[PDB]
Amino acid sequence: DIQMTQSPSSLSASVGDRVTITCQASQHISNHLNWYQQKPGTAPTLLIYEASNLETGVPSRFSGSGSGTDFSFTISSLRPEDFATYYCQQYDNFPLTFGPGTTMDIKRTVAAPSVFIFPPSDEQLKSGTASVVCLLNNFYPREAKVQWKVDNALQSGNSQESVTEQDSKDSTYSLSSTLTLSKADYEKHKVYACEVTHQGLSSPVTKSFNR
Amino acid sequence: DSGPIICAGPIHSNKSAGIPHLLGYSEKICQIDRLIHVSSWLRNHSQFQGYVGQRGGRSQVSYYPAENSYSRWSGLLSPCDADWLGMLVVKKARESDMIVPGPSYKGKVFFERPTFDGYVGWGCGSGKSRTESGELCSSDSGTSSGLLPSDRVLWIGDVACQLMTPIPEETFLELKSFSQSEFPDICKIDGIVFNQCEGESLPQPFDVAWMDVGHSHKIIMREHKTKWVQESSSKDFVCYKEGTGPCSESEEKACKTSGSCRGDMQFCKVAGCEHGEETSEAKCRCSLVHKPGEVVVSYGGMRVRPKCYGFSRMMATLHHH
Amino acid sequence: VQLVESGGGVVQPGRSLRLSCAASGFPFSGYGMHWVRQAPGKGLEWVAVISYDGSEKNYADSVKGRFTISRDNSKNTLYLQMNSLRVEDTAVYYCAKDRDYYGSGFYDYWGQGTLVTVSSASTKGPSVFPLATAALGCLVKDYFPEPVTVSWNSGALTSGVHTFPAVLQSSGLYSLSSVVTVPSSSLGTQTYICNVNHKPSNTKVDKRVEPKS
Ligand SMILES: *[C@@H]1O[C@H](CO)[C@@H](O[C@@H]2O[C@H](CO)[C@@H](O[C@@H]3O[C@H](CO)[C@@H](O)[C@H](O)[C@@H]3O)[C@H](O)[C@H]2NC(C)=O)[C@H](O)[C@H]1NC(C)=O
Ligand SMILES: *[C@@H]1O[C@H](CO)[C@@H](O[C@@H]2O[C@H](CO)[C@@H](O)[C@H](O)[C@H]2NC(C)=O)[C@H](O)[C@H]1NC(C)=O
Structure with missing residues (x-):
């Protein structure tokens, strides 16, 4: 019924700076918007209810405002705990709808990844499947993507990527892009290249191997 | 079901929030549409925490007799509604004040009864609700939230309250007599000596028509005649912003003195509307309230605009023979 | 206060599962009760609600006809019978208390969550x-x-x-x-x-x- 849209999708600010989240609406919600914090792996926790009130235990750094359609949730002095995903929620009309979430992430100096590539084992290549793995290590910011190539042929949709959480020390992320082929297809080809683009590399990166 | 006069059922957030003293006939009517007046009474008198009427509002108040005609006319005002509007008082119950049989007092937090001398209410408090008899409040965990459903509110009788056209005392006495002439068996109604008896029976239910002419006791009636006249007074109009909600004293007075404000057909006919200006904007719109009009009763030979009128239950004592 | 879920596990499309949100510390019979689920990687989606005495129920869509919510105020547990389970319903399921009497939508205290996966797959070791x-x-x-x-x-x-x-x-x-x-x-x-x-x-x-x- 009521679509609740948040913005920005993801922040990237460091400790001590001031954050602002924005949550809009498709109808007049009045003062009926709650706010939620959800740390990774934990359960969501209510921070602000009725767009101004602070639930018991919520520090005074967290603030809220807004009346009608547009709201805001303002953290004044970011602390390492306050880095989590944040959601808004209306209760003006059931069904109760949520926002799409804002993922507060920490910020540091730009870091280029350290790309490694792994040819498949032989223990795996007797089941009929070969899995090539390209590893991106300790880079910031999170935004970067890999592109597999089999003999200079851009592969499409036969790979899968995973990203670690932001490191508690490096403030960097890591990526694991796995390219999967059949053994009958793996033995058909020669060069298995992994091309890496990132904000910290003035030229595109490649790590390959001839099997 | 009935219909919100100006404000939808309230969705409160904390039991510990204030009950503000708004100043506009509108702002108040909003507080009535959202059972704030009852909530206050419960708190003030009966030492209660929170709000009653969550999500429902005045539209969902439980009534006895449940087949309450006036309930549909949202504009028609209960005894409690008019307390907030200053027209009368609903009094904290005393031991004397008799609780009538019939109503489903159970889990109820508030129940109101028109009495022969006035209007009385019986409020429970924190985390308690009335027993199956109305006589005692008892712990009810389902009342621990302080944000309670409207069904926990019982208004008894098909009462309609309005602004009296003041009558002289001679008329009241003439009316007093005629009732006694009509009801010559009753001795005491709700505790007030109606006809001299000396031989009273024990108190007993009594369902009668009645009006508050504005004097000591209500006048009870057997053969009455009621005409509902429409009068299109300012009080027959409420002013709202679609959005913000109720309008404030000045805004209302302005609207009800300017014409400019948006309004429904009748409001235009009466006081003036004005259009061709609103581009995006928003201004207070005023609308007629939904009601048969103002009632005028006919009894004893005499035509009276009573404060309140209705058919309710009033414990009473008949003669002995 | 402590809400704690239980009941989740592997299940395949067509089958049914039962959840349970046992409660402690607070007057379970005075408050409405929720169900909120989080799909792996996605955001939050409210599932179902139930009121103080277990009469007025409002489910979301996407579950109507497949989900039945219930409670037993005598033993302070919250049930959720999920039939006709599909792949779209694989998510982490939470229960939440509500400050009100009916479930108006304030999720003050959340449970620690239980996981339900719906897929036809068998069980295979790595x-x-x-x-x-x-x-x-x-x-x-x-x-x-x-x-x-x-x-x-x-x-x-x-x-x-x-x-x-x-x-x-x-x-x-x-x-x-x-x-x-x-x-x-x-x-x-x-x-x-x-x-x-x-x-x-x-x-x-x-x-x-x-x-x-
Ligand atoms: C419960 O108790 C509160 C507190 O006494 C009541 O609020 C009071 O309501 C009366 C209603 O007439 C207010 O009187 C009016 O005050 C304004 C100025 O604020 C004045 O212009 C009017 O002429 C009139 O005197 C009063 O101010 C307000 N507050 C206080 C502190 O008395 C409330 O009405 C009570 N509710 C019930 C159901 O008993
Ligand atoms: C309503 O507001 C009140 C006042 O801020 C809250 O009351 C107490 O808050 C303290 C912490 O500041 C808690 O230790 C108490 O337990 C609270 N009282 C109660 C009765 O819970 C109260 O929490 C607010 N209402 C809700 C539902 O959170």
């Missing part, structure tokens, strides 16, 4: 494969269901370990990667072993890693 400052790792492939736990050298090696969030595959079997960075001068000077542990299928594997020609 196939662990090695991956040769230098980098090496272990390929935990083709298992079902989650979770998995990967240590390294029986919990000794911790610095530089990255256990990647697993990825569902078209076959429905999960597969993750765990990697470590070693100081190049480890060939012979150090031995590395990854300890995979898939408790839901009792599969515990310890794969060694070595130079290769």
Whole structure:
């Protein structure tokens, strides 16, 4: 019924700076918007209810405002705990709808990844499947993507990527892009290249191997 | 079901929030549409925490007799509604004040009864609700939230309250007599000596028509005649912003003195509307309230605009023979 | 206050499951009760609500006809019968108390969540494969269901370990990667072993890693 849209999708600010989240609406919600914090792996926790009130235990750094359609949730002095995903929620009309979430992430100096590539084992290549793995290590910011190539042929949709959480020390992320082929297809080809683009590399990166 | 006069059922957030003293006939009517007046009474008198009427509002108040005609006319005002509007008082119950049989007092937090001398209410408090008899409040965990459903509110009788056209005392006495002439068996109604008896029976239910002419006791009636006249007074109009909600004293007075404000057909006919200006904007719109009009009763030979009128239950004592 | 869920587990499309949110510390019969679910990787989606005495129920869509919510105020538990389960319903399920009487939508206290996966897959233990400052790792492939736990050298090696969030595959079997960075001068000077542990299928594997020609 009521679509609740948040913005920005993801922040990237460091400790001590001031954050602002924005949550809009498709109808007049009045003062009926709650706010939620959800740390990774934990359960969501209510921070602000009725767009101004602070639930018991919520520090005074967290603030809220807004009346009608547009709201805001303002953290004044970011602390390492306050880095989590944040959601808004209306209760003006059931069904109760949520926002799409804002993922507060920490910020540091730009870091280029350290790309490694792994040819498949032989223990795996007797089941009929070969899995090539390209590893991106300790880079910031999170935004970067890999592109597999089999003999200079851009592969499409036969790979899968995973990203670690932001490191508690490096403030960097890591990526694991796995390219999967059949053994009958793996033995058909020669060069298995992994091309890496990132904000910290003035030229595109490649790590390959001839099997 | 009935219909919100100006404000939808309230969705409160904390039991510990204030009950503000708004100043506009509108702002108040909003507080009535959202059972704030009852909530206050419960708190003030009966030492209660929170709000009653969550999500429902005045539209969902439980009534006895449940087949309450006036309930549909949202504009028609209960005894409690008019307390907030200053027209009368609903009094904290005393031991004397008799609780009538019939109503489903159970889990109820508030129940109101028109009495022969006035209007009385019986409020429970924190985390308690009335027993199956109305006589005692008892712990009810389902009342621990302080944000309670409207069904926990019982208004008894098909009462309609309005602004009296003041009558002289001679008329009241003439009316007093005629009732006694009509009801010559009753001795005491709700505790007030109606006809001299000396031989009273024990108190007993009594369902009668009645009006508050504005004097000591209500006048009870057997053969009455009621005409509902429409009068299109300012009080027959409420002013709202679609959005913000109720309008404030000045805004209302302005609207009800300017014409400019948006309004429904009748409001235009009466006081003036004005259009061709609103581009995006928003201004207070005023609308007629939904009601048969103002009632005028006919009894004893005499035509009276009573404060309140209705058919309710009033414990009473008949003669002995 | 403490809401605590229980009941989740693997289930295949068509089957049904029952959840339970047992309560302590607070007057369970004075408050409405919720169900909120989180799809793996996605945001929050409210499922169902129930009122103080268990009469007025408002479910979301996407569950109407498939989900029945209930409660027993005598033993302070919250039920949720999920029939006609589909793949779209794989999510982590939470129960939440509400400040009001009916479930108006304030989720003050949340439970610690339980996980329900809906897919037709069987139960299969992982196939662990090695991956040769230098980098090496272990390929935990083709298992079902989650979770998995990967240590390294029986919990000794911790610095530089990255256990990647697993990825569902078209076959429905999960597969993750765990990697470590070693100081190049480890060939012979150090031995590395990854300890995979898939408790839901009792599969515990310890794969060694070595130079290769
Ligand atoms: C419960 O108790 C509160 C507190 O006494 C009541 O609020 C009071 O309501 C009366 C209603 O007439 C207010 O009187 C009016 O005040 C305004 C100025 O605020 C004045 O212009 C009017 O002529 C009139 O005197 C009063 O101010 C307000 N507050 C206080 C502190 O008395 C409330 O009405 C009570 N509710 C029930 C159901 O008993
Ligand atoms: C309503 O507001 C009140 C006042 O801020 C809250 O009351 C207490 O808050 C303290 C912490 O500041 C808690 O230790 C108490 O337990 C609270 N009282 C109660 C009765 O819970 C209260 O929490 C607010 N209402 C809700 C539902 O959170």
